[model samples]
Target: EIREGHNKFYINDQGKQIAEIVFVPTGENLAIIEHTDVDESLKGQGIGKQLVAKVVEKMRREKRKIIPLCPFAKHEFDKTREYDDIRSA
Candidate 1:
């Protein structure tokens, strides 16, 4: 399950984060996503991409933009054309 926090979105499993993404605010309406990961066991299920998508969706809802600094987030941004509108420089 996905849970949102002030600076993260995570999946709780066995009292630990089985998957998560984190971001740091960089401007009044911009944030830099610095890290994203999924448990190795869940690696190929696209959970990481889902977390990034959630972050992007939330940013769009709030009229914000994002700098996808995390490698996985960055890659997804490049390939996901639907997300370009919310990508910040």
Candidate 2:
């Protein structure tokens, strides 16, 4: 399951974090993604994409936009048309 807090979204399995995306809220409707990680053991299975997807969903639901500073997050946003509406300057 995916879980979130003040500035992060994460996946935990059996009490260990398997993947996570961390960000900072830059303004009322803006967030900047600082980092993202997927366990090496699960790297090629799309865990990273799943983590970003949850962040995207949450941001969209809250009427928020994102500035993806993390390289991985930036690439995902650039390639996905759905993210265009919620991308920040």
Candidate 3:
């Protein structure tokens, strides 16, 4: 399961956390809100994008596809060198 809060997020397996998203969810396809008050502080740290990547990797490994509903995640996929391998198209 996934749970998130401002500047904090948790991805859990059977109620045990494995990783954190570090961004709050907006509930649209479980998309996270990128326009947080702490966005400026998070810039260059790559925490948001890292969170999305981790989530995507988990989904891919689990044979699940994401909707890419968040602009932040979409942009991350678009700009990432890893996209060529992860993305279906």
Best by lDDT: 1
Ranking by TM-score: 1, 2, 3
Q: What TM value does model 1 have?
A: 0.93
Between candidates 2 and 3, the one scoring higher on TM-score is 2
TM values, all candidates:
0.93, 0.90, 0.49
Q: Per-residue lDDT of 1-89 in model 3, one digit per residue for the tens?
A: 44655545555554655545433333333333233212354456655666776666655565544445456666776787765454542
Error of 3 at 79 (Å): 1.5
The window of 10 residues in a row where model 2 has the poorest summed lDDT is 5-14
Q: 19-79, model 2: which lDDT tens digit per residue?
A: 8899887668988889999889986688888888888888888888999999999999989
Give me candidate 2's TM-score against the actual structure.
0.90
Say which candidate scores most in TM-score. Answer: 1
Query: In model 1, which runs have C-alpha deviations exceeding 4 angstroms?
Result: none
Q: lDDT scores for all predictions?
A: 0.90, 0.87, 0.52
Worst 10 residues of 1 by lDDT: 23-32
- Which is the winner by TM-score between candidate 1 and candidate 2? 1
- Looking at model 2, the pairs that clash are none
